[PDB]
Each structure stands twice: as structure tokens, then as C-alpha cells.
Design a protein around this ligand. Structure first.
Ligand code: HEC
Length: 124
């Protein structure tokens, strides 16, 4: 595990750098607000990455669609996550297109992947 996680980082980082020579590496201090910033959707409705994945992804989320239960999202915390890359290399763009209404920035992904592959301490 991680092999992919690390790849993504080294991936989304390259792409970004390929777009903005300024961006070279990610951080673990940006993957918070962006995931805790009550943003508005193009479908007239506010939401947040912490609306389902809670303020903390490593924690137990909850879908506001069915209201079942979304176990820890932390793809790193869980050994049964972030396995495939091909697929994952889309489900992330399709998501932002169904969350924000478009494809998230390449520098916003490597960021999340970082914080996701960084924080591994849940509350309870
Ligand atoms: C509820 C309406 C959600 C909000 C708000 C956001 N996401 Fe989400 N996410 C949601 C679901 C139903 C799923 C599928 C898995 C599950 O059990 O819920 C996901 C999955 C992700 C993933 C993993 C993708 C994969 O590895 O296949 C990521 C990385 C992810 N979500 C990130 C993410 C971000 C960045 C969000 C704000 C821009 C966000 N989610 C909001 C449901 C919901």
C-alpha cells in the first residue's frame, strides 16, 4: 500500500508543476480548509467535503443521500482503500463534477491526497 498513494502525490504534483512551475510539492496544511470550507454548488445548494466525510475523513462519514454509514474515508488509514489507480484516476474528477460541478484543480488533489496520506488519527 501507499505505492499508489505516493504515486498520486508524485503524479498530481508533476501535472500541477507542468501547469504551474511554481507548484513543486504539496503540503499538509492546506488539506483542511479546502475540506472544511462551506462552498456553494452550481446546483443551488451549499455543501462541504465535511458534509459527508465529516470534518475529518479519517472519521466515520455519513451520506446525506441514504443516511446509512460511510466508514473511514482515509484511504491510507484503511488497508482496503486506494488500491486501483486507473479507476481512481477518474472517480476523483467525476466526483468534483458532482460535488463542485466541475473538475477540481490538479493542485487541489495532490493536496487532499497528502493530508489523506498524512493524518491517521481518528477521534473515536
Ligand atoms: C456527500 C454528499 C459527499 C460529499 C459532500 C463529498 N463526497 Fe466524497 N464521497 C462520497 C461518496 C458517497 C463516496 C463514495 C464512497 C463512500 O463510501 O461514500 C465518496 C468518495 C470520495 C473519495 C474516494 C474516491 C475513491 O477512492 O474511489 C474521495 C477522495 C472523496 N470522496 C473526496 C471528496 C472531496 C474532496 C469532497 C469535497 C470537494 C467530497 N468528497 C465531498 C460522498 C460525498
Amino acid at each position: 500500500d501507499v505505492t499508489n498513494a505516493e504515486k498520486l502525490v508524485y503524479k498530481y504534483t508533476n501535472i500541477a508543476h507542468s501547469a504551474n512551475p511554481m507548484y513543486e510539492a504539496p503540503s499538509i496544511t492546506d488539506g483542511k480548509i479546502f475540506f472544511n470550507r462551506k462552498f456553494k454548488t452550481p446546483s443551488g445548494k451549499e455543501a462541504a467535503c465535511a458534509s459527508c466525510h465529516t470534518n475529518n475523513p479519517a472519521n466515520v462519514g455519513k451520506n446525506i443521500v441514504t443516511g446509512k454509514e460511510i466508514p473511514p474515508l482515509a484511504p491510507r488509514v484503511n488497508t482496503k482503500r486506494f488500491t486501483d489507480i486507473d479507476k481512481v484516476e477518474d472517480e476523483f474528477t467525476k466526483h468534483c463534477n458532482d460535488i463542485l460541478g466541475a473538475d477540481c484543480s490538479p493542485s487541489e488533489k495532490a493536496n487532499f491526497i497528502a493530508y489523506l496520506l498524512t493524518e491517521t488519527k481518528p477521534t473515536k
